[PDB]
């Protein structure tokens, strides 16, 4: 009985999930807009601390300053903690929600002798899809967010006399908003589904 | 045998029984009725069968496998021998007919063209082959009943297990799918039905039958 | 036929509907606290540039004062609408997955002959609850991170020997907040609710 | 009459035709069998009478009320007077027997104490009182087909359609749930069942027989 290879399976995994995105077109744009701003937000807040920063290094006195930085380290990180939570746990509802309208296909898969595995891939790779898509709909947002952003900071650096310019996310850091896309796309749709799949009965 | 009982019995949450000492054998190629009442147990033994529901008092061997306390991660495994036809002919509308009898063959990776022919030939064999692209929905219900048969036998399963397949069909067409199920056999393949009507049990009196009477089989 | 008042059964669907939201503690626990943290944002950075302008009202000055102001409206503004959209976005999944979660309900109770706006006040009501109780998270979650922030703002000013303290938002802000959330919890249920239940069929 | 058909006919999205110039005409109090093959249309003819599905071709009539294009708005009012029992005995598994029965009367805003001696009432006319606080889950088969003739009854609709209620029994408890159906009928309540078994049928001859091949009605 030939079989198809590892690597094989999975590239049509892939494919067949990201086509599968498509099938609904209003339930899936939505949690993509929703998880695009909410990992953009804390990308801007983080953007504007460094500049602020960047003004700060550039420029008793050094010892309030310092103080200065902390604080706003201590509120970003806060923003960031709460939206970093927040796309968590909306990518689990989300799949929660798929694999409630797949439950007459998962029901015949398991009740023909399927293993877990093969149910449970392809919402893994829908999952990081979310996850990746985000990241890049966030990267774009943030641009765009710089781009209005400049227009207003001239006004405020041609008034002190300075040539200061906003300087965007540096490309070694897109792949770390990248990277955190798709873990996150990744582990949430893990977590979720795992727990959730077992209670799903064949009959 | 195919399958075997060695005093098994169930005793559901609620505290109602469904199967008490029932003891029965199966050698292959044989086929069986298990006529029963309209309660008794013939849905739970078809249950307990295929592992969907595990025992309490007795023992089930498979092929001298004990399969009473089966791990979860290999009822997989055993899935994969036993076929299944339910009833409500249990199909997915929104997929083809050709891609609803595959399925079987896709949850084991199997190239496709293998696939396609394997299904041409089931279908083929079912009288199904030339509506084999149309989609369930425009098919009568007979139709969709054969289509779920070759979904079950598309695998080439050992054993074949019918829970009253004849459920939402007239008289005229219960003749047909039993004369499909009875080739099937002459295949070579193991078949024990569950039904409830003694009419079509009484007609054909050469394969043995096994009654389920509250639980109870007398297997005369 | 005795039949209940138009108040008496309003109010039943109210409390009915209140708890059926603890039915699923695990699906209506994790939206509530997403919901609680994106409208937490916008409340929090309001009450950062409400301080900051106390600040520089309290304290040549003059013109680059002006440009610094027209820049943090910009920015408070720009990231709250992102989080405004993202909380009217939300509601409308959740209120997707429930009434998917209730198909077979709905198919018989349209087969009975329930009229549409029977089978619709319950989802608006839910809607209208998820609203009011993120507003009272995210008032808590920014009264809690004032009082987060009010030790290191004091740790800060003890080197200025400012002697300045953060001050909460203000009651007046607070019954807008609420009602901007029951806004949207009622809004996007209605719509979201009201176009999927044309398309669930009695059989 | 309590239903009525002028050329009456359906053609479904792909091209078959369920109905061709049907016509029957029901008398208040009268019960009819409309027998017919696996196929034929028995199903979409009780869907046309409660306005699931609209004809194409006839009209229908209702109490002398045009149902042909009744507006959307319109068919709760409608439904409420038809009552409707299913083969599947559609029951919600997770609400009690009293909640289940009680839903029609819930639909249309009722005091809780009227609801309750009227559940009651209905609950002991079909026996399951008793069992009035279970959950569905606890019943037998033909308890759960009891409990949904119930619930459709219990608003005294004037006409009570049921669509093969014995598709899941067998033959024993077939005479029960028809000996039920007959003593709704003497309380005056007009019935319009539908079956393919002919034997069923054959064993009652006081009730008119219509009999649908092939989405004609030879009313004989
Ligand atoms: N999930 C369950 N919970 C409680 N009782 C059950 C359950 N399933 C079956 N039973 C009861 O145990 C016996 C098994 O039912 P079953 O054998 O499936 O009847 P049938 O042969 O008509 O399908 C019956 O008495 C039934 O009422
Ligand atoms: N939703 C549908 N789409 C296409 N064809 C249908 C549909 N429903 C019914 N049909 C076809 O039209 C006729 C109506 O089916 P039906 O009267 O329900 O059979 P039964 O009496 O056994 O329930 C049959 O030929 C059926 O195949
Ligand atoms: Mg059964
Ligand atoms: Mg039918």
Redesign the pocket.
């Known amino acids: 009985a030939k079989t198809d290879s590892f690597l094989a399976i999975h590239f049509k995994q892939a494919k067949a999930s990201f086509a599968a995105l498509w099938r609904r077109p209003l339930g899936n744009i939505l949690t993509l807009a929703v998880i695009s701003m909410a990992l953009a937000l804390p990308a801007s807040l983080y953007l504007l601390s460094k500049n602020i920063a960047s003004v700060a290094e550039r420029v008793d006195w050094f010892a309030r300053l310092d103080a200065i930085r902390h604080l706003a380290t201590i509120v970003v990180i806060s923003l960031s903690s709460l939206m970093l939570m927040s796309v968590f746990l909306i990518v689990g509802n989300t799949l929660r929600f798929n694999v409630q309208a797949n439950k007459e296909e998962i029901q015949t898969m398991k009740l023909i002798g399927a293993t877990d595995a093969y149910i449970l891939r392809p919402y893994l790779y829908s999952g990081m899809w979310f996850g990746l898509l985000g990241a890049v709909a966030a990267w774009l947002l943030t641009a765009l967010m710089t781009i209005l952003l400049n227009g207003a900071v001239e006004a405020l650096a041609q008034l002190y006399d300075s040539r200061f310019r906003l300087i965007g996310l540096g490309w070694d850091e897109s792949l770390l908003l990248l990277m955190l896309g798709v873990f996150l796309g990744c582990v949430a749709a893990k977590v979720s589904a795992k727990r959730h799949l077992k209670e799903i009965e064949p009959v | 045998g195919v399958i075997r009982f060695q005093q098994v019995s169930k005793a559901?949450?609620?505290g109602?029984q469904?199967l008490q000492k029932v003891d029965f054998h199966l050698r292959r190629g044989e086929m069986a009725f298990l006529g029963?009442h309209?309660?008794?147990?013939?849905?739970?033994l078809l249950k307990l069968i295929c592992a969907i529901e595990r025992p309490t008092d007795g023992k089930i061997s498979f092929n001298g496998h004990d399969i009473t306390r089966i791990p979860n991660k290999d009822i997989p495994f055993l899935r994969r021998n036993i076929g299944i036809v339910f009833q409500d002919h249990r199909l997915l509308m929104d997929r083809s007919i050709y891609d609803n009898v595959a399925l079987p063959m896709r949850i084991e990776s199997i190239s496709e063209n293998e696939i396609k022919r394997r299904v041409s030939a089931a279908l083929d064999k079912t009288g199904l082959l030339d509506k084999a692209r149309c989609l369930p929905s425009q098919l009568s219900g007979g139709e969709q009943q054969r289509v779920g048969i070759a979904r079950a036998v598309v695998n080439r399963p050992t054993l074949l297990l019918a829970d009253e397949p004849t459920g939402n069909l007239d008289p005229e067409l219960s003749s047909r799918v039993l004369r499909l199920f009875e080739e099937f056999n002459r295949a070579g393949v193991t078949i024990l039905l569950a039904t409830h009507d003694i009419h079509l049990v009484n007609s054909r009196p050469q394969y043995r039958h096994l009654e389920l009477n509250q639980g109870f089989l007398s297997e005369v």
């Open positions: 559901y949450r609620g109602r469904a029963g309209s309660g008794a147990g013939k849905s739970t």
